[PDB]
Amino acid sequence: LEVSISDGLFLSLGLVSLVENALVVATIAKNRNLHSPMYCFICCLALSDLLVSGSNVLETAVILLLEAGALVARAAVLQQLDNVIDVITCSSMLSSLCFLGAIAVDRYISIFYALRYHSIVTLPRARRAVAAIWVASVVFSTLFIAYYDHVAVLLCLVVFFLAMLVLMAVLYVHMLARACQHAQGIARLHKLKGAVTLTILLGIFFLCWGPFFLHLTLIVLCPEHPTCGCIFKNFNLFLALIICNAIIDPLIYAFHSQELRRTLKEV
């Protein structure tokens, strides 16, 4: 089967996700109450999703204008364009994954070190972690998209996705464990919502990133194989699903708070 997502839909998803993330970023940039570490990481996530969406928008636009015969670059000068735009996409992907990890780590410290939270996660350390993330993301993306023909690139990027999935799962499952302990304490004094939320977070995460990193794994597993070939036919679905997480993460994290809703209404 081939879900065969055309450029037109790919561009539409990319632009709607561009608008959604531009809104989240602009709202956090304007309303200075949202200059807190957790909203800083939400802004940086939304910015990574903005750069993913915009990079893939520009990529489909370039491919459309080339296919229309409006663009006449060739060889090295076109390969360098494809290479730099693919560094932009790969870096904003790695950053988005890292800021999902960072939101998970912020939330985790905010539960289990709740009393020391403002002693541990601070705007200096938030900005340092954000910078370290964007730096490492560009360094590794330039390495990966230069060395893109090398197995170790694909393997390291998959292992990185699996590490983020393991991190984020461990963190939010332990947060749900403490929520359920608190729900039992509440019931004991008073005498699933958090399971639903965990299912939205980890589900959209795995359903949107995982097919891409599955493809990249299957390349290492299948330089030629007929069943792997079927999944390879779906790579445009997998990229459209990455843009879909770029759509839904604003809802999962930013408009997850009333203050963002107010701030979007105020604009």
Binding site: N56, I145, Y148, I219, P223
Partner: peptide
């Protein structure tokens, strides 16, 4: 030359 969406969309 080819300009593929993303990278690695096809093997090798």
């Amino acid at each position: 030359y080819s300009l593929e969406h993303x990278r690695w969309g096809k093997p090798v």
